[PDB]
Design a protein around this ligand. Structure first.
Ligand SMILES: Nc1ncnc2c1ncn2[C@@H]1O[C@H](COP(=O)(O)OP(=O)(O)O)[C@@H](O)[C@H]1O
Ligand SMILES: Nc1ncnc2c1ncn2[C@@H]1O[C@H](COP(=O)(O)OP(=O)(O)O)[C@@H](O)[C@H]1O
Ligand SMILES: [Mg+2]
Ligand SMILES: [Mg+2]
Ligand SMILES: [Mn+2]
Ligand SMILES: [Mn+2]
Ligand SMILES: [Mn+2]
Lengths: 448, 381, 448, 356
DNA sequence: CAGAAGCCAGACATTAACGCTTCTGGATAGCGTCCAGAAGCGTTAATGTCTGGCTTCTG
């Protein structure tokens, strides 16, 4: 998943055909480098370019589309970002571009153009946005929700994984390592339970919609029949039909009351039969989940989280021996730190210091990336910020750990405003402003 | 001399959105009738006259009607301040209650007062101590500790009681008149008041405990208790009000008076069958005022739609259901699984068996649930 | 409102009792100070004592109570935190404490005991949580919600205001300034509309719930009536009895149908009139009003957000002249950034770098603090980590602007890790980390 | 026979986050002293004793202390229910108040005894006639007053007791629907409230306005802060008298430019009088409120004065605009047309009225 | 000018914001009653995405 090249145009502060490729000697020597410059020069921009080219979205912008597009540099015509990446043994190419109304500095925004293709093959694997997203997700093994917290750690949201609610935390572990059927079966179970419950409710509505004559009304009507019949036997033609007409009125009402009761009795028998089934349906729903994997998805993913924390423990011991991580006895998917020096303290991650929380998040990200090494291997990492909160006596250990990781084929590119690593890192991509003109540039070797 | 010992009226209290005005008025008229029958001279209430700082209007109307009706008998009334109530809400009527031969002692620092008998002779000496808010007796000091505050407050309240008892004794001088002292504090989770530190007064009126009882086994320290039940833990217990016989400056005896239960209450515990059996016993009698009932279900099964099933069970009887409870506390999780199992090679049947193993069902609904999940699984193949 | 003292014991990682007073040989002037030390050595804990003792809620832990008290350091059984602050020429005193069972390192917790008192007279004004938390807010003019984003920019939450939800921002603005009558109107118009809609319903259901005979059945009953009417004239006594009996059945059916029909016509007239009533409330509820007072409050807070941004621009011009905030025409009120260098370029706040976003958030928070100045004066601000991301020249300009602000009564405290800034700042409350035991210590002049 | 007339006491009114305890107590003490000095037979108040239906605690204490002090005088006090004031809080003490020789209020006329217990006159107790209790409403109130007058006349017969009528309403010909002025029943004296500004009405002394004895707003800070004395002679009216009240909190209103008002504040340059003067500020400049308040505070902090509110006489802060104005601004985006807007504004008025 | 790439105007699958309903922790308790807060599902207008007509530049 290591990135091979980058190409951007009119993105944020940067303006004009800046292409960098890691196949060259300075980046292929070791694969580890650093980026520096003034704030706002484009340090985050040249790292968000690959994120845009891969997933059509940035950590700072919810979406880019035919409307509300503002990532292009002010007063420019076309902005594009193209990257080349190698998954398994073959390299691919991802492309994104956007044009104004007529290349003028103002006007309507046009629909984006996206192309995902294999390098040196000429095969356009996808030509539409949704198809491109599906294909790139399938081939890379990384959706945006997995990439933005397993491969790239943007500033400000580095602690998001530790501070993520289980509703969004469990989905990542579900997407990784397969096993997507749990949420599906939970949603289907909830849907069928809702159907089997709403079918019973309408029977209750029919149950309470049938008018029933009261027993007092029933007896009073029956009593009138005897009165009408007895007065008849006491006999003229006028009162014959008079009693007889009232006799017919009562007979139908009793017949209708019996018919109303007859319909109710059958329906109550039916209601009783499917009531016993819906009881078990609700009981099952109470421990299998509802809608978007509300329950039992965390139950299934607890084992994956246990494996992830087991790997994170052994990686964090190598990083630094201050804390160990393990799952806490809570219903939610949570991990709590263990104080090695105290050897007994069991405290949640909410009380950690800023630097220790950053280190824990980095360790979790590294272990999570290494967990899925079996399928769609990941051999890259980027850190926008986080080293500032660390002191010099620990930042050195952090850099030593990153060097130990980079000793393998993994490539790590960090960004930091702290000058304590300007000599530790040999390669620096210097970025410079231009006389306060509102734009920025970099080394001429990468310009085109 | 006879005096009534009561407290914790809690006028205007809302009990699950149900008013207590009817039972409070019933108790007020019953107490007035008992006072007229027993020919009392002074009545003392030991705090918590109003449930909240700003009681509703009807509670104030009830209090005014009670004081007006008590004015007819000519007996004296003493009103103590609690912790729940408002000292300002008591003082706004303390000034005007003086003309009615009733005293409100909500404000701290009240001097001892002589309780006159019906014949005009001095009957007893009051020690009307309301609830002692820390803001009225102590001063804040820096350099403190976590537990030093409790000891300082205890010392301050003990000193206040000692000083007030000494002042009352020196005011009564040598006449053989009984000494009465009020109180609205708990007496022996390390927050209490030692029993032996009370001054050796003739009789101590202590409140703020809804269960009437004796403290330390000493006869002249008593808890009056609530006049009416205020929760479901005292529904089946009879409330009491104390009358005290005083003569020649010494206590003789006290007798408990049962409070009529105008609004009966009961609580139920058990599974569905037991609850239904206990609820159906009300079919014989017909309670014109509805009886308030509590349901405490202790079982493990689901009981789908409790709020509708209970309503259906109680629709045919004048039994007002107020609250329900179930033993819902339960935790669920996959165990360590030997630190080796993984979700990829694990089976959905195995995880379902593990999930159901945590539940207490064994075979009866277990087989039906397993068949149900097999049917659910079969529709995605 | 400014802070005059502080005390804590076993708060987070500071065993023993510590106390710092801002009335000593250090802190004699109102100059800005700083706190420095190794990362994770209780650097924020010194800033947590103020927040805990004031509002019973640390910026990290949601609440502290008889349960889930993760704040206390391990192997301890008691903690407390006291604050002495001054407002309007008079001083007060807040307090908080908690113990364990029998003063043991294990067992359940006791209910925390609090205190609010005046330092001059020595009396206490509050002793319960539910009243103290309101009395402190009434006295200082700011509760926890206004405190945490007006005078304490905690680490990682500096940009909270900019990225806060529009409902949260509207609630903050209305709570800080104005009267909640808009909120009550909005929350009550919706209740009236719901009542009108509910009473409108259950009348249509009653109208539809009564079964009516169709006109064909009405004619069928009428036809059978005349059919049974003719042969009775053509008529025997037994035949007359059964014939007239059937006549009564039809007559009562026609009688009840007319009665049922008549009732339905009555309901239609009420519903037809009520349909004229429902538009009275539907349009009102659509234009304004909602649950918890959202739409009307959000509409009303624009007029005060205009004033807030007007103050923010003036504040920011002397702090960072590259940007002027503006109130864009958005239904959900938001601040809009105008670029001076880029010839009045307009773009969303979300697409800003970390340092410039921090500057914008700080300017907005300062303007918010100075908006309530005419009522109550706030003379304290403790900005936490996040200030060090700036470049040296930009950081120097920010420090110079803070110094210029410090000419007023504001006693700014800055918590960060910049070496140049910590050298520049005269006063340093240094914290010394222990040699692996896990605890931290202050200077010997503060311990007691 | 002598009667003291007052109305619109409005106890518990938070005058812009302030209190009225000291001035209320001083006015009550003055009222008691004047009543004792003039040997007045009875006291009447035309409703609106409390600001709202849930008055603060100190208002109850003030009212109870006033009544207790009145007890030593031995006079008679009658209290009516105001418009904003709810009858629920007044009826609470009705039983005790009657025992304390005072009446509170559908009712029947009552005989007003003298200090020696002899019947002096008769009064007509009419509280705020709520629409639920009773075009159509005008006739309802008119013939209700007619029936009450008939009952009073039946009670009188040939007795020489003068008839006194009480009410809490506004009438035509008065300035800050309306019961017509000429429709008054022929009574010796009729007392009206609900209007803080005392003024002449009807050309005859049978109907008079006492107004309010305290300043309810800066607009009513004029000298017309009087309390009326009504005297009777052998069953006929003797004369009408007006009483000047003391002030324990002066009101000051300022208008003009910033320089002019700053010059005006120099009149109170370190006077150091014991009552802090409350200031109403009206500035015609275009400067924003949030910093013009700071400018005002840059000068008022040294003077012995207190600033209550700042107003611009004519962007802007919500305190400058009213609820009706902001709602009309909200309606700018919708089509007002002809009736939709009328119905919507009427419904909004109903909602704002039913909110409190 | 004839025709193609580009630009502008219509239906359909997500989606984010209230609102309702249920459930639960905290402030009080001699370890009990409401008050407020949080989670999860249902509605709905808004929106991005895919598909069908005009317009300027190349041959
Ligand atoms: N449309 C635009 N016009 C001008 N400047 C822009 C525009 N969009 C983004 N920018 C600028 O792009 C820069 C991006 O900086 P960024 O890479 O986020 O900085 P950092 O690496 O310090 O976080 C910011 O200075 C921002 O103001
Ligand atoms: N439950 C606990 N028991 C003991 N010590 C703790 C506990 N929770 C946190 N701590 C300590 O408190 C420290 C607080 O970190 P702090 O220095 O305030 O953060 P930052 O470095 O971001 O300013 C933690 O690093 C840890 O050493
Ligand atoms: Mg950055
Ligand atoms: Mg920190
Ligand atoms: Mn009690
Ligand atoms: Mn008035
Ligand atoms: Mn009125």
């Amino acid at each position: 998943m290591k990135i091979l090249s980058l190409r951007l145009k009119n993105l944020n502060s940067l303006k004009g055909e800046w292409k960098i490729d890691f196949t060259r000697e300075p980046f292929a020597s070791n694969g580890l480098f650093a980026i520096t410059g003034p704030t706002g020069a484009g340090k985050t921009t040249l790292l968000d370019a690959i994120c845009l080219a891969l997933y059509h979205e940035t950590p700072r912008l919810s979406n880019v589309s035919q409307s509300q597009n503002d990532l292009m540099t002010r007063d420019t015509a076309e902005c594009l970002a193209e990257v080349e990446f190698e998954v398994k043994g073959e390299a691919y190419r991802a492309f994104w571009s956007q044009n104004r109304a007529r290349n003028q500095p103002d006007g309507n925004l046009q629909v984006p153009r996206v192309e995902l293709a294999r390098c040196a093959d000429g095969k356009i694997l996808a030509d539409k946005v949704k198809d491109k997203l599906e294909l790139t997700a399938t081939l890379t093994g990384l959706d945006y929700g997995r990439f933005t917290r397993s491969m790239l750690l943007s500033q400000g949201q580095f602690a998001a994984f530790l501070n993520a609610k289980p509703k969004e935390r469990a989905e990542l572990l579900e997407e990784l390592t397969g096993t997507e059927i749990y949420g599906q079966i939970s949603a289907m179970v909830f849907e069928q339970h809702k159907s089997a419950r709403t079918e019973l409710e309408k029977l209750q509505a029919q149950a309470s919609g049938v008018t029933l004559l009261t027993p007092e009304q029933v007896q009073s009507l029956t009593a009138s029949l005897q009165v009408l019949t007895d007065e008849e036997k006491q006999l003229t033609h006028q009162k014959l039909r008079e009693n007889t007409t009232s006799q017919g009125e009562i007979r139908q009402q009793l017949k209708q009351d019996a018919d109303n009761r007859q319909q109710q009795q059958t329906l109550m028998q039916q209601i009783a039969q499917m009531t016993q089934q819906v009881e078990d349906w609700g009981y099952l729903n109470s421990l299998i989940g509802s809608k978007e994997g509300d329950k039992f998805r965390k139950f299934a993913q607890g084992l994956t989280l246990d494996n992830l924390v087991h790997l994170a423990n052994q990686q964090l011991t190598r990083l630094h021996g201050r804390y160990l991580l393990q799952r806490k006895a809570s219903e939610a998917l949570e991990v709590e730190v263990v104080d090695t020096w105290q050897a007994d303290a069991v405290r949640d991650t909410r009380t950690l210091s800023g630097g220790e929380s950053f280190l824990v998040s980095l360790a979790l990200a590294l272990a999570l990336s290494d967990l899925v090494s079996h399928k769609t291997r990941i051999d890259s990492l980027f850190l926008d910020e986080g080293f500032g909160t660390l002191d010099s006596e620990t930042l050195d250990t952090a850099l030593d750990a990153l060097d130990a990781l980079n000793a393998s084929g993994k490539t790590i590119g960090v960004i930091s405003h702290v000058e304590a690593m300007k000599e530790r890192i040999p390669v620096q991509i210097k970025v410079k402003k231009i006389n306060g003109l509102g734009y920025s540039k970099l080394e001429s070797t990468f310009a085109v | 001399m006879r005096i009534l010992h009561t407290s914790d009226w809690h006028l205007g209290q809302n009990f699950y959105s149900k008013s207590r005005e009817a039972e409070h008025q019933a108790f007020l008229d019953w107490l007035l009738e008992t006072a007229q029958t027993h020919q009392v001279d002074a009545i003392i209430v030991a705090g918590d006259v109003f449930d909240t700082g700003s009681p509703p209007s009807y509670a104030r109307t009830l209090y005014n009607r009670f004081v007006v009706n008590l004015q007819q008998t000519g007996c004296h009334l003493v009103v103590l301040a609690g912790n729940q109530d408002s000292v300002a809400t008591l003082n706004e009527s303390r000034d005007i209650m003086a003309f009615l031969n009733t005293t409100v002692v909500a404000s701290a620092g009240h001097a001892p007062q002589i309780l006159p008998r019906r014949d005009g002779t001095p009957g007893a000496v009051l020690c009307p101590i309301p609830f002692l808010r820390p803001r009225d007796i102590i001063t804040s000091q820096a350099g403190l500790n976590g537990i030093e505050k409790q000891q300082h407050l205890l010392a301050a309240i003990t000193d206040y009681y000692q000083q007030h008892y000494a002042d009352a004794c020196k005011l009564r001088g040598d006449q053989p008149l009984p000494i009465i002292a009020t109180g609205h504090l708990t007496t022996v989770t390390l927050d209490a008041f030692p029993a032996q530190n009370f001054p050796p007064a003739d009789y101590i009126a202590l409140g703020h405990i809804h269960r009437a009882q004796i403290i330390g086994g000493m006869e002249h320290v008593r808890y009056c208790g609530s006049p009416i039940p205020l929760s479901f833990d005292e529904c089946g217990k009879s409330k009491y009000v104390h009358l005290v016989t005083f003569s020649n400056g010494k206590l003789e005896s006290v007798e408990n008076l049962n409070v009529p239960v105008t609004q009966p209450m009961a609580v139920l515990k058990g599974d569905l069958a037991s609850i239904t059996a206990q609820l159906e016993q009300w079919r014989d009698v017909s309670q014109e005022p509805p009886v308030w009932l509590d349901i405490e279900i202790t079982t493990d099964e689901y009981l789908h739609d409790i709020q509708r099933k209970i309503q259906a069970l109680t629709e045919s009887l004048p039994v007002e259901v107020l609250l329900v409870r179930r033993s819902r506390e339960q935790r669920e999780r996959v165990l360590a699984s030997q630190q080796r199992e993984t979700l990829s090679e694990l089976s959905v049947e195995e995880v379902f068996n593990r999930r159901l193993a945590l539940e207490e069902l064994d075979e009866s609904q277990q087989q039906r649930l397993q068949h149900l999940f097999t049917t659910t699984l079969h529709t995605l193949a």
